[PDB]
Design a protein around this ligand. Sequence first.
Ligand SMILES: C/C1=C2N=C(/C=C3\N[C@H]([C@@H](C)C4=N[C@H]([C@H](CC(=O)O)[C@@]4(C)CCC(=O)O)[C@]4(C)N=C1[C@@H](CCC(=O)O)[C@]4(C)CC(=O)O)[C@H](CCC(=O)O)C3(C)C)[C@@H](CCC(=O)O)[C@]/2(C)CC(=O)O
Ligand SMILES: C/C1=C2N=C(/C=C3\N[C@H]([C@@H](C)C4=N[C@H]([C@H](CC(=O)O)[C@@]4(C)CCC(=O)O)[C@]4(C)N=C1[C@@H](CCC(=O)O)[C@]4(C)CC(=O)O)[C@H](CCC(=O)O)C3(C)C)[C@@H](CCC(=O)O)[C@]/2(C)CC(=O)O
Lengths: 208, 208
Amino acid sequence: PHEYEKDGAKIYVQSFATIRAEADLARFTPEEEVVVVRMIHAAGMVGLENHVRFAPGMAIAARAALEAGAPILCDARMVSEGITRARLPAKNEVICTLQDPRVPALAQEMGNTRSAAALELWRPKLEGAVVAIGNAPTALFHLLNMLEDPACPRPAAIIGCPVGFIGAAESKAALAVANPVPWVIVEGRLGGSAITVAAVNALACRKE
Amino acid sequence: PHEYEKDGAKIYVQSFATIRAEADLARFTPEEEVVVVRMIHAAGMVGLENHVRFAPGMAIAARAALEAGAPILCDARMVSEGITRARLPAKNEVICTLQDPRVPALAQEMGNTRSAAALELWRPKLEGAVVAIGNAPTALFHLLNMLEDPACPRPAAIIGCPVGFIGAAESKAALAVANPVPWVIVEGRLGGSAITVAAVNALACRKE
Ligand SMILES: C/C1=C2N=C(/C=C3\N[C@H]([C@@H](C)C4=N[C@H]([C@H](CC(=O)O)[C@@]4(C)CCC(=O)O)[C@]4(C)N=C1[C@@H](CCC(=O)O)[C@]4(C)CC(=O)O)[C@H](CCC(=O)O)C3(C)C)[C@@H](CCC(=O)O)[C@]/2(C)CC(=O)O
Ligand SMILES: C/C1=C2N=C(/C=C3\N[C@H]([C@@H](C)C4=N[C@H]([C@H](CC(=O)O)[C@@]4(C)CCC(=O)O)[C@]4(C)N=C1[C@@H](CCC(=O)O)[C@]4(C)CC(=O)O)[C@H](CCC(=O)O)C3(C)C)[C@@H](CCC(=O)O)[C@]/2(C)CC(=O)O
């Protein structure tokens, strides 16, 4: 038969050790470094770290929000279903409103994507939340517009890592410029659900 | 406010057109090319195509299985929850057994990961299925071992795209060598849920 390593705890330890041996991680603070390592792990891509940018204090602020019970607001089910419930420190709600039955009509009325329209339903959970956007650039752009209204509840942190060729790089660059609340991005076209979930999972639990 | 493109249908068309303008896709058959384009789209990574390998006729065989109602067996919820139900041609079941309450004890008895142990529960749905492994190399390795028994039901196709530093590259190289049923892999460390879902979504529906 095929031989392979079967101890999952060991696999993790070896994965992170390989990443730290290969990656260029010196510029990150200790709190940022843990997040970056998990993002690399999720992507299978040493070199990803050359594209990661954090607002000063974001990693600290996001961990603190999660430990205080902040909900995690997710743009897609691939993000929400990714989050490791066993790693959550304070029974944190993991929310994705994309499949709410009101979203298709709302999107049509708004002249926007379903991904973006769904964020309107985040309002009651948004104050102090950790936002995890791993897919839709239109969700990130729309969030920036929502937060231009001083009446809008404001999250504790935004993990802004949508992926793609159209609008993704722009949405993340705009997030960094706007600096609405502490943020992390992957600059450029790279990003996605797995990198986003890794960031959340890293910030949720002090144990790697 | 921030200006951005909000027409999702248009965004797709532009994304695929950008990918085809930049990517090196000549060696793929028409059926393979559609799959590769969607994988690039999901990864935000022109250059991914340099790592993609198909068994001859896999893309044709997998589309045919799906159109015939084959279930899709998924190693993780980030894969199963990714699959676009609106794109499925024949009311195909999308299955992930990872969270079955019997898996933790089974994994312990088997001395294996939960990801791998869960595949034992695939047996009743495995014959003629499309397998979508986007995460766990141990799931792919274990599947290869399962299929070494002539009594094991055999899938119609395997999308073998686990990601990572430990065991991933090895598991996919082993799949290609073993050639148990028609396969697609991303060679090396790259892969993951998003690329895997993209492959399924591409093969499910003739419309991009
Ligand atoms: C499945 C899926 C996937 N998308 C991916 C990536 C991209 N697609 C975007 C556009 C094409 C787009 N995609 C639809 C939007 C549907 C909508 O919101 O109206 C919208 C049409 C619009 C969103 C937007 O552009 O902001 C949604 C969000 N993508 C989904 C569903 C997620 C559903 C859920 O999670 O509950 C979705 C809601 C469609 C659906 O299934 O109903 C991006 C646009 C940028 C670009 O195209 O270059 C980008 C590249 C990010 C891969 C995943 C990436 C990952 O997880 O890491 C992939 C798996 C690829 C695929 O289609 O097979
Ligand atoms: C969330 C999550 C994530 N994994 C990723 C990637 C990897 N991790 C592997 C090892 C570390 C591993 N990971 C656990 C296994 C738990 C298990 O099955 O016992 C096992 C421990 C073992 C699986 C295996 O090695 O075959 C599982 C599968 N990963 C999950 C849960 C998926 C649960 C579900 O889907 O229902 C999981 C079941 C743990 C859990 O949450 O309970 C790989 C090993 C190779 C390596 O480490 O370099 C590899 C890199 C692939 C990212 C996703 C990648 C993607 O979607 O594209 C990320 C998001 C990273 C993260 O942990 O934040």
